[model samples]
Target: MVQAWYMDESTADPRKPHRAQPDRPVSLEQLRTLGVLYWKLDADKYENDPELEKIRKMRNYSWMDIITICKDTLPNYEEKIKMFFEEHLHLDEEIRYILEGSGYFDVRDKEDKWIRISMEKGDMITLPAGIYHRFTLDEKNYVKAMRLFVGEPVWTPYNRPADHFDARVQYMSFLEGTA
Candidate 1:
């Protein structure tokens, strides 16, 4: 069964807000201490194989349409990086379901702390806008996910020097099979 994660907007402090749908009711104090978003995918739903036909029928999307989809569907969606070497970056409340593959979501916390969370089939994650994050597919590239963003007419200008981080790019290339 997939559980619903809820954010406690009522008492959440904006400075270090912790937003995520919780399986069970939790106190504001408990949320404050966690300071991270977490949730699980429900079985046989949108993220499941049986529902792929339904989801696909809903829309035929190109890689370019991803940003527009996110802006219309999610709130506070914006673009952070564009032409990421070859990948594009757009901000939309990120919601994705891993289907038939694995990947890693690398994120940086407010304190500049870094963490990488691995995801596999039947897994879904939602992230708010402005969260410094990046994702990479598995070794065989056996990964697919549905992403949802939080705004409309979603478009943004990209700003990042191409050679700003050559080392990082090289490392990522090795991971993506170019190595």
Candidate 2:
């Protein structure tokens, strides 16, 4: 199941008027409207699933990687977390399909409001390129997910004060259906 919640960046905690709790039904379209695309991954049919293939072909993804993040696998885990732990925008979209454990992706919407999306096993989501977002593992601090990319993966992140950056400006135009 997927859940989406509104967050106030001004506050560290996002529950200021929290959502209806876990089990709240969140549809794919609901996320798409926020510029995030979510999909249910089927482990058994993954190798050659038509849906997966279509995404790869349509998105020009040519590589796939499986990453397991745990205490032992990554040293000083918190500091090495891929995400900068701050609102940032990427040159490309951030795609992840959870294989185990869980995490949360919080994205900033057009209104400058935040949306927290919880992801667990068998859940896949593709954040549009240039979206302002951040990622965090749950209390367990463990997560294994599949990452996809068009060419080699780009690990660059532009932190805050990115309002005037080309990517951000372009993304805003895209959201306005002008790109």
Candidate 3:
């Protein structure tokens, strides 16, 4: 299962859970209100997994690839982790399935408070485009994830303060509609 809560204002190690005092927990329904989606699948059955195929076909996700993030599997892991933690948004939805290990994805709530999401193996999350968010590994310092996209994957991220972009404007309208 996925776990989420408001983040504490701590400069401590990003790998820590960083749960706010008294832990105001966030649920899947709350995340859905922000256009985020989640599901749990059998990661070990990824190869030709029936449920995975159904989701891909349903969502038109035609491209996918696996990536392992850690000091050994990834070069300049420290620098890359820093870059990943930078608040940013993409022009298209960011879909990830945790294949192994665990990590945190922090997304901005309606009031701009950061909600830290804990993802472990078998968890799949889809973050709507233009949402302000960032990612970091947990104390374990490792994760293997499967990236899915509708077509050719776009790896580019527009860093924070990018409200001028069309995607950001469109996302704002989406929020308005939901509200």
Candidate 4:
């Protein structure tokens, strides 16, 4: 089963708070021999960071555009959506920043246990690669995040064939009256 926890600025201890613990950890290495990496992003600095411009362009919009783009485009866009949902592999360390709205990081541990951390604007999280995880956007239909990879992007191969219908159909249903 999956367990969800909410970590915000207010709850975080000023000292020794950024590190992950076993009871509250979110990585694969602690439980196995998997390789993992982590990184953090300062939303205030990132907004003016030149290095992020390339990433922004990939999405074809400025930061504000994130609020208007359809949520479907996020998970079903033509580019690299396949590797994200259907396949299981670590491309690199996962990084996220809640710039505009809120969301949760659904993390799965080795014991088949899961954790969901509710994140809000200005919040940042970094998880190692190979961690079984997915993010859920808020009901407001808005989220802005930045991801980092260890090497040249590589998509994981699914042992089973892709389930196109199931992907679109399920999400379509969930998104029906929400947005």
Candidate 5:
């Protein structure tokens, strides 16, 4: 199951505004409305899953990987380097399919409100380029996930307070179908 929340400029807990919550199970339509794409994965099929294979072939992903993460190893987990739990966005689309355990994928909604989406096994997401977002492990601090990418993934992240970059602006227009 997936869980999501919305926190805007007018929410309590200014220190950590994302503490609030939303009803569990975020919908694909709602995610797309925010410029994000969602897909369901079958853990059993994994490498054979149609959607996974489709994106891999469609995106020309040269390499694919399966990663197992736990607290002790997470710190040194060679992910796109950034402070743990800090909010940021990527230049290329971010794609992942969780195979085990659970985690949180928090993204900025249409109005830039913080929406935390808790994802578990069988959940996959494609976060569009330039969308402000971040990820963190839940209390368990352990998860196994699959990463799909086109070519060698740069995985560079731009932290928040990014002064409305061009990609961000263009993504808005694309979602609004005005671009």
Candidate 6:
């Protein structure tokens, strides 16, 4: 139930929809081809939801923390936002469940074009390790999200050009298989 589309090349604010004039859309299936996973859960019921519990147990998501990003809640908000919007990849999957507000997750297609996924409350997404991607708040400029981890969360993000990492190589193989 998420909306995704090709991003237009623009110098404007990242919060603005950079949709191409023709509005090329990307489907959930297309997102899966790039190793992204999605789920829609009840934000209010997540703490006791059977589906979320099953997913956490199945995926070994043993740790989770809540974070609210906004001009008020986050210190040095601008600096952090810029860092988050930078193209980067994690050594572990980046998983987030939106509890409040909205944002965009941008992932690279096989052809390296940006596919912007618009996410709102109740939307959960998992970005596989070693994918080139970025995130930003929408015009609302605020989002309260739950971050999930398999074990202890390793918050390291390798910026683009990290092809030398083993995770990056494995992800490339995944892409090949998907193709």
TM value for model 2: 0.81
Candidate 4 TM-score over all chains jointly: 0.46
Write candidate 6's Cα lDDT for 98-161 as tens digits.
9999999999999999999999999999999999999999998889999999899899888888
- Per-residue lDDT tens digits for candidate 4, residues 1-179, read 11234232343322112323434544333322222222234566765865455544653324232222234755544344323333232434455555666665554443435445556665645554445565544455556665444444443432222234343334334334331
Return the lDDT, model 3, position 10: 97
TM-score against native, each model: 0.43, 0.81, 0.97, 0.46, 0.78, 0.97
Tens-place lDDT per residue, model 2, 151-175, is 8999788887677777777888788
What candidate 2 gets wrong by more than 4 Å, as runs, is: 8-27, 44-50
Give the runs in model 6 whose Cα sits over 4 Å from its true position: none
Candidates ranked by lDDT, best first? 6, 3, 2, 5, 4, 1
- Candidate 3: list runs displaced more than 4 Å: none
Candidate 3 lDDT by residue in tens digits, 32-148: 989999989999999879999999999888999998998987888878888889999999999999999999999999889999999999999999999999999999989999999
Worst 10 residues of 1 by lDDT: 80-89
In lDDT terms, how accurate is model 2?
0.75
- lDDT accuracy of residue 60 in candidate 6: 90
lDDT score for residue 60 of model 1: 30
Question: Against the hidden true structure, what lDDT does model 3 obtain?
Answer: 0.92
Residue-level lDDT tens digits of model 5 in 3-100:
56665445342324254434344566688787677767787789677777786787676677887777566566645323535677776778888999
Prediction-by-prediction clash tally: 11, 0, 0, 2, 0, 0
Tell me each candidate's RMSD, in Å, in order: 16.0, 3.6, 1.0, 13.4, 4.0, 0.9
